Design a protein around this nucleic acid. Structure first.
Lengths: 150, 180
RNA sequence: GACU
C-alpha cells in the first residue's frame, strides 16, 4: 500500500528536493507508472545529485501541484535519467496524501532567502535538518483528501 | 552548457597547484542564504555582503593593499558544506545596486576571482575551532567572520585536497534559468 | 534574516 506508519527515512546521508508539478495529470501518470519528468535543467540537477549519492543515501522528492495549496506525496528517486525519447527517471511513491501548506508554512529554507518550504520552485532543495521536520510532519499527518480522490 | 564552458576556460577552477600564497594574507568566511547568489557570483565575478560585512571586507582589503591576498570561504546556510573559495579583487563600491542577486536588498559590490568551486562537507572542517569566535568550529561561523592565519592554513589545505563529489556547477543549468 |  502507501503511507507507511513505520517509515525510517534514513536521511543521514541523503538529499531531499521539492518537485513542483504543472498538472494533477502528471501526478496521476507518475503514480501509475513510477516515473517522473522534470524540465531539461531540473532533470539534470536531479541526475547529478542522484549519481553523486551513488546509493550512499536516499534522494526524496516532495510533490506539490502548482497552485494546489497542499503537498500531495513523497517518492524516492530510483534511476538515473533516461533520454531515449524528454527525460525520464524511475520513482517509488512512498506517501500519497494531501498535506496542506498551513501545516508546513512555518518551515523556512535558509538556503533560499528564508522562504517558506511552501513557497519553493521546481527542484528546490531542502536542507537536511529542515527536511527531517518536513517529512515528519508529512508522515504523521492524518489526511482527509488524496490525489486518488480524483 | 556553453556558458559554463566559457567560465571553466578563463578560470582554472579547482587548481591542483594552489600555492595558497598567504603568510601575509587574510581570510574570511562568506555566508549566503541564497544559492542563486553563489551561482551569480561565480558568473559575474562579484560579491556583496551586508553593510557591516561590506565595511569589514573593505577594511581588511585596504590594510593589505596588495601585500597579501584576501581569500573568501563561501558556504550556503543550512547546506552542510562549504561550496568554494574566492579571492577579493577590488575595494567595495558601496553605491552600486548590481540587480543580480536573488533579493533587491543587497546594496554594493566588489570584484572576486573564484578559484575553487567544490562542495566540502562540514565534517571535514568541524575540528578546526575558531578561538576568535567562542571556540565554535569554523563550520559554525557567521558572515565575514575572520579566520586567523594559522587556522586558515589548516582550513585552506583540506579544501584544496578534498576529493569532492558535488559542486554548484552540477546545478548550473538550474540556477541559470532561475535568472529569468 | 547572508551561524551550526
Amino acid at each position: 500500500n502507501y503511507n507507511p506508519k513505520d517509515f525510517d527515512w534514513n536521511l543521514k546521508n541523503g538529499r531531499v528536493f521539492i518537485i513542483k508539478s504543472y498538472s494533477e495529470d502528471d501526478i496521476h501518470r507518475s503514480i501509475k507508472y513510477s516515473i517522473w519528468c522534470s524540465t531539461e535543467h531540473g532533470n539534470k540537477r536531479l541526475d547529478a545529485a542522484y549519481r553523486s549519492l551513488n546509493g550512499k543515501g536516499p534522494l526524496y522528492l516532495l510533490f506539490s501541484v502548482n497552485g494546489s495549496g497542499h503537498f500531495c506525496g513523497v517518492a524516492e528517486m530510483k534511476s538515473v535519467v533516461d533520454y531515449n525519447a524528454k527525460g525520464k527517471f524511475e520513482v517509488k511513491w512512498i506517501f500519497v496524501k494531501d498535506v496542506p501548506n498551513n501545516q508546513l508554512r512555518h518551515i523556512r529554507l535558509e538556503n533560499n532567502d528564508n522562504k517558506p518550504v511552501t513557497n519553493s520552485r521546481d527542484t528546490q532543495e531542502v536542507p537536511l535538518e529542515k527536511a527531517k521536520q518536513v517529512l515528519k510532519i508529512i508522515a504523521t499527518f492524518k489526511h482527509t483528501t488524496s490525489i486518488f480522490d480524483d
